Amino acid sequence: GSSGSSGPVHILSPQDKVSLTFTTSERVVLTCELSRVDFPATWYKDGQKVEESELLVVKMDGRKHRLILPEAKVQDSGEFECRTEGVSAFFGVTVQDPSGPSSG
Numbered sequence: 001g002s003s004g005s006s007g008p009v010h011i012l013s014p015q016d017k018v019s020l021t022f023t024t025s026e027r028v029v030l031t032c033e034l035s036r037v038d039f040p041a042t043w044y045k046d047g048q049k050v051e052e053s054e055l056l057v058v059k060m061d062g063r064k065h066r067l068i069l070p071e072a073k074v075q076d077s078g079e080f081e082c083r084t085e086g087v088s089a090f091f092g093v094t095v096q097d098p099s100g101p102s103s104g
Contacts (some may be wrong), residue, residue, distance in 0.1 A: 009036040009086040012063075028069040030091045032082045036064040039084060046078035067091075080090040 008041075012033040022028045028039035043050040043058060043065075050067070052058055057068035065082050081088045 007035075007083060008069075008085075009034055009039055011035070011082075011087050011089055014045060014089060014091075017090045017092065019094075021094045021096065022072050024072060024095055024097040026072050026095075028067075028072040028076065028091075028093060028095070030067045030080055032065045032089050032091075033061045034065065034084065038065070041065055041082050041084040043067055044081045044083055044088075050080075059069060 012035060014032070020028075020030075024066055029076055041060075050056055050058075055069065055071055057070065059066050059068060065097075067082075070075055071096045072093075074095050076099060080091040080093060
């Protein structure tokens with residue numbers, strides 16, 4: 001038993017809007033917790049679904065969701081959100097390219 005809850009699922013962390021900054025050609029891994037184990041969710045970037053691929057790794061864990069990135073490109077820079085059946089989180093990301101002497 002041990003039942004008696006009002007909301008289906010509520011986020012535990014973060015608590016409020018966060019801010020993060022990384023450098024191009026680096027690894028970016030976010031973090032998010034939930035109040036429900038084995039619960040579905042969809043990541044959104046800049047208000048647009050994320051294109052899961054080799055450049056985008058999505059790890060899921062009991063009441064724990066995070067977005068990993070092998071190559072944080074200037075494009076990867078934006079706001080992330082772990083949409084779910086209840087609430088959503090906000091993670092600020094900024095990929096700043098390192099000062100390079102006209103190097104390609």
